[PDB]
Amino acid sequence: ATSGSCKGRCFELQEVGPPDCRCDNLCKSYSSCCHDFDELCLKTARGWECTKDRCGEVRNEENACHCSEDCLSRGDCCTNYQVVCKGESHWVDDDCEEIKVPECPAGFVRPPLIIFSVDGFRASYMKKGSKVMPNIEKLRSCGTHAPYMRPVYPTKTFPNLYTLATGLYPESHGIVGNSMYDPVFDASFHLRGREKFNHRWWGGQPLWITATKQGVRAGTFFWSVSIPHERRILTILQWLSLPDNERPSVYAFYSEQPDFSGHKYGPFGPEMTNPLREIDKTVGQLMDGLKQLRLHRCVNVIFVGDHGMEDVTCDRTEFLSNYLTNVDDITLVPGTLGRIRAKSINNSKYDPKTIIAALTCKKPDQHFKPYMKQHLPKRLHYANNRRIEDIHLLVDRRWHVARKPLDVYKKCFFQGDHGFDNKVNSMQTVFVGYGPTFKYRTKVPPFENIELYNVMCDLLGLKPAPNNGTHGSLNHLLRTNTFRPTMPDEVSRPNYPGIMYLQSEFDLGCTCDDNKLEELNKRLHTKGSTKERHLLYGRPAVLYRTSYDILYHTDFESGYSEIFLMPLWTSYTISKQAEVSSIPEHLTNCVRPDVRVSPGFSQNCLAYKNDKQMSYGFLFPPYLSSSPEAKYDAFLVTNMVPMYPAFKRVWAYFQRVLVKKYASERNGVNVISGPIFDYNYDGLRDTEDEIKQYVEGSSIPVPTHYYSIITSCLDFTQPADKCDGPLSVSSFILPHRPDNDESCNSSEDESKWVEELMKMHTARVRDIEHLTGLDFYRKTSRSYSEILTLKTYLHTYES
Numbered sequence: 001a002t003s004g005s006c007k008g009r010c011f012e013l014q015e016v017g018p019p020d021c022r023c024d025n026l027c028k029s030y031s032s033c034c035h036d037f038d039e040l041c042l043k044t045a046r047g048w049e050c051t052k053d054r055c056g057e058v059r060n061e062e063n064a065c066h067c068s069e070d071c072l073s074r075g076d077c078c079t080n081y082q083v084v085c086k087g088e089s090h091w092v093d094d095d096c097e098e099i100k101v102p103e104c105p106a107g108f109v110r111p112p113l114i115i116f117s118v119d120g121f122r123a124s125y126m127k128k129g130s131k132v133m134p135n136i137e138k139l140r141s142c143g144t145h146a147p148y149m150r151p152v153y154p155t156k157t158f159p160n161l162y163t164l165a166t167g168l169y170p171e172s173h174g175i176v177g178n179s180m181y182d183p184v185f186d187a188s189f190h191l192r193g194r195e196k197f198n199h200r201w202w203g204g205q206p207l208w209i210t211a212t213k214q215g216v217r218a219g220t221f222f223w224s225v226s227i228p229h230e231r232r233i234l235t236i237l238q239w240l241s242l243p244d245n246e247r248p249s250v251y252a253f254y255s256e257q258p259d260f261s262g263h264k265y266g267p268f269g270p271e272m273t274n275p276l277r278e279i280d281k282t283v284g285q286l287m288d289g290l291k292q293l294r295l296h297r298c299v300n301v302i303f304v305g306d307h308g309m310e311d312v313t314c315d316r317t318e319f320l321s322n323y324l325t326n327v328d329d330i331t332l333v334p335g336t337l338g339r340i341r342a343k344s345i346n347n348s349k350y351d352p353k354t355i356i357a358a359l360t361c362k363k364p365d366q367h368f369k370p371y372m373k374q375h376l377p378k379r380l381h382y383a384n385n386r387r388i389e390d391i392h393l394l395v396d397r398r399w400h401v402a403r404k405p406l407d408v409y410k411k412c413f414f415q416g417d418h419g420f421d422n423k424v425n426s427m428q429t430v431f432v433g434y435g436p437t438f439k440y441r442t443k444v445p446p447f448e449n450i451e452l453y454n455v456m457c458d459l460l461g462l463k464p465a466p467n468n469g470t471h472g473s474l475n476h477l478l479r480t481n482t483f484r485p486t487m488p489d490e491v492s493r494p495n496y497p498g499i500m501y502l503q504s505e506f507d508l509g510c511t512c513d514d515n516k517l518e519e520l521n522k523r524l525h526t527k528g529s530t531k532e533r534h535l536l537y538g539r540p541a542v543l544y545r546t547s548y549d550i551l552y553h554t555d556f557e558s559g560y561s562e563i564f565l566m567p568l569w570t571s572y573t574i575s576k577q578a579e580v581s582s583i584p585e586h587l588t589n590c591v592r593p594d595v596r597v598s599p600g601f602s603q604n605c606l607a608y609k610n611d612k613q614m615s616y617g618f619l620f621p622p623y624l625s626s627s628p629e630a631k632y633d634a635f636l637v638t639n640m641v642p643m644y645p646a647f648k649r650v651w652a653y654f655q656r657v658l659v660k661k662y663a664s665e666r667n668g669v670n671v672i673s674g675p676i677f678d679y680n681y682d683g684l685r686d687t688e689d690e691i692k693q694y695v696e697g698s699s700i701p702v703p704t705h706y707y708s709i710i711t712s713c714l715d716f717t718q719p720a721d722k723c724d725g726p727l728s729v730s731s732f733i734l735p736h737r738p739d740n741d742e743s744c745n746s747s748e749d750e751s752k753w754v755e756e757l758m759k760m761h762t763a764r765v766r767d768i769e770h771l772t773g774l775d776f777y778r779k780t781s782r783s784y785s786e787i788l789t790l791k792t793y794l795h796t797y798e799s
């Protein structure tokens, strides 16, 4: 019904309900615009710039923008009007001056926010393209910037734009790729075409909805591709000239560049200079335009990308047809990641186990690795959605995976792509904030794009919907409007058991070959006399209802679960000077009852003997005991945890070699280790009724993962246990697997593969918090916002 009119309706904010014709910034994309949309709304006459001869002209409403006297009040001047016609300077030529307070026109209730989003803008463009992007360089140097911003996985456009909008992981917002099949709708989502416009795909609450629901007006964020950039900018500036009761407070611009060119020419192709220049010119138009409206010291501006761009060519393609004989029985979502499902749900002869094995470590330099999705690095948060296929391929940077060669030459063309692991340097993107609410000439550490939703809410005075950001962790970007969170309340208080059981009350099937001056000595140790050394940041708080005990020892402190029959956490400090020792021969198979903990709340050695697949390890490593006498404590049944022999190779090397290495490199480290149970791969602590595996014959639950949090002084001239200032952390969440199939070199010595495994499984403290229902760093001398920043830190081990 496109015989309605867009007269006086151009770029209307409220989308009219068809079958009435549309005049909003998306109507082109649904082929739904009124007949006169182009004529009235996409004027082009005379181009985009005032010239000296158009100054003071009589208004001609055919023109794309105006150079008449009345244009400022009307809000439709070309962005260079005051420069060309009133001898003003371009914004970029003006010195930076601190913006201490919003300098807004009367009637503005809050500083507007404008998000300037750029597709495929790789983080290193800020330095490498700086000579050709002066407007962007001024935003960056005068505002608040990060060296880079980490996207989410997969590092594709729609997952990342919707993460920016919602503060959610793709698994939670449901946009898990640029292409998807949802088995409960039995429907497909694609970039091309129209099913993606169906609202059932899009979960959580995006910023524009959050705004609307709380009485803040929002501009429409999505722009049809054919609307020229100049027109997008002029539309924003027109909206900003609306009356107070109609004018939005939040706007987004989007550019398809430099992504579009990057795919064709590679991230640093010589052809990339012009797209970067053109983007910079658009930023300049916006800023000149704000300046003429007296809004350039009023508005907060965010310059942000969705992902970066890597060099990728046709010839760097792995073909599943080279591995699988059965290739026509699978559907592959291809490219910079792979997702595999059965071609037909009626094929009972499909077996994911046999596909995985056919794809595992088959060629010496194989450029992808298969995973069941629950085994992917937990830092990716890429499993808890039915739209994510069980079988996943993590593709090496610079490579593609495809089903058959004909897929790649029956479509070389492209030189750039993205989608890879979000740790990869080429995938990193940008963040700049400029305005009254951002800090002045401030650099901040790199951070994840899941955090920005909360900040954008802070900037608009909105209460954010529940999301995966850690609200407060980006307070250091802001001059004001910080969010002041309180530490969560401890839900369960610990018991502190003393000696309550005699040795002969235990029938655990365990065995161990085991003065009065230092008899008091060991009593004080068991009462917590060394605890200030081994528990540096306070005990972790337990944020759920459970029954647990604090157990003190010479070398380590633990919070021992009576429910899970093992520690939730074990804490210990290893100085620079500490010595590694062996497990003495007499103690090789030693497990000792803990006379503080009932036999009924203890593990037993007979279960491990019976269970031919499962062995055990220790959370506090016997190798790092302070003394031969202290070493007995490490063999308590309360320090034992279930470990597959294959995993013990990993764990033993970490404990015997790597902990001491870190303590030497970082001037002591504090370590907190423990189990994780996430059988439903939702990234959250399992309740006891969610556990799918026990040690045979017992109530001993088997962890899905083992974590460690390794903390030291950021100023490494100070020892970990005597640190005056900011901390440094690195953490991991290691999968507890019965094989080392993940590691193709695992036949080799652990010095050749364990550390690279651990790096792959690097984690944020926050990730561990979700997975354990523990809250760490409760008792430091640092600000809580600083600790939140520390908890979101990821050590990426990239160059």
Ligand SMILES: *[C@@H]1O[C@H](CO)[C@@H](O[C@@H]2O[C@H](CO)[C@@H](O[C@@H]3O[C@H](CO[C@H]4O[C@H](CO)[C@@H](O)[C@H](O[C@H]5O[C@H](CO)[C@@H](O)[C@H](O)[C@@H]5O[C@H]5O[C@H](CO)[C@@H](O)[C@H](O)[C@@H]5O)[C@@H]4O)[C@@H](O)[C@H](O[C@H]4O[C@H](CO)[C@@H](O)[C@H](O)[C@@H]4O[C@H]4O[C@H](CO)[C@@H](O)[C@H](O)[C@@H]4O)[C@@H]3O)[C@H](O)[C@H]2NC(C)=O)[C@H](O)[C@H]1NC(C)=O
Pocket (backbone or CB within 6 Å): 168, 169, 171, 172, 173, 174, 200, 201, 202, 203, 204, 381, 384, 385, 386, 466, 467, 468, 682, 683, 684, 770
């Ligand atoms: C990252 O941040 C997010 C947001 O904070 C965290 O996700 C939240 O996690 C909560 C715990 O898992 C979860 O709470 C559940 O909500 C159920 C109600 O859900 C609807 O309502 C909300 C609010 O409007 C809405 O956001 C939800 O949106 C999801 O689902 C739609 C599909 O309809 C999607 O479009 C959208 O993308 C989103 O999908 C994601 O979440 C769902 C899970 O809800 C996943 O399945 C998807 O894969 C995807 O990840 C919904 O529209 C509520 O019913 C649940 O309550 C049950 O569960 C517990 C016990 O298990 C119990 O206390 C209750 O009694 C109840 O049990 C009964 O029902 C069970 C389930 O059917 C049944 O098995 C039992 O037998 C019982 O009878 C639950 O409270 C919250 O929804 C999501 N929110 C979002 C946005 O994802 C996420 O955890 C964070 N991640 C990390 C790692 O920290």
Ligand SMILES: C[C@]1(O)C[C@]2(CCN2C(=O)c2cnc(N[C@@H]3Cc4ccc(Cl)cc4C3)nc2)C1
Pocket (backbone or CB within 6 Å): 029, 115, 117, 157, 161, 162, 164, 165, 191, 192, 193, 221, 222, 223, 224, 225, 252, 253, 254
């Ligand atoms: C066929 C196609 O039509 C699909 C293609 C590839 C991406 N795109 C778009 O249409 C496209 C158009 N507008 C926006 N705006 C973005 C959305 C968003 C989310 C959060 C934030 Cl904070 C800011 C923004 C501005 N994003 C995307 C071409």
Ligand SMILES: [Ca+2]
Pocket (backbone or CB within 6 Å): 119, 120, 156, 157, 158, 259, 306, 307
């Ligand atoms: Ca993109």
Ligand SMILES: [Ca+2]
Pocket (backbone or CB within 6 Å): 677, 678, 679, 680, 681, 682, 683, 684, 685, 686
């Ligand atoms: Ca779980």
Ligand SMILES: [K+]
Pocket (backbone or CB within 6 Å): 608, 609, 610, 611, 612, 613, 614, 615
């Ligand atoms: K065993």
Ligand code: NA
Pocket (backbone or CB within 6 Å): 740, 741, 742, 743, 744, 745, 746, 747
């Ligand atoms: Na292996």
Ligand SMILES: [Zn+2]
Pocket (backbone or CB within 6 Å): 120, 157, 259, 260, 263, 418
């Ligand atoms: Zn792209």
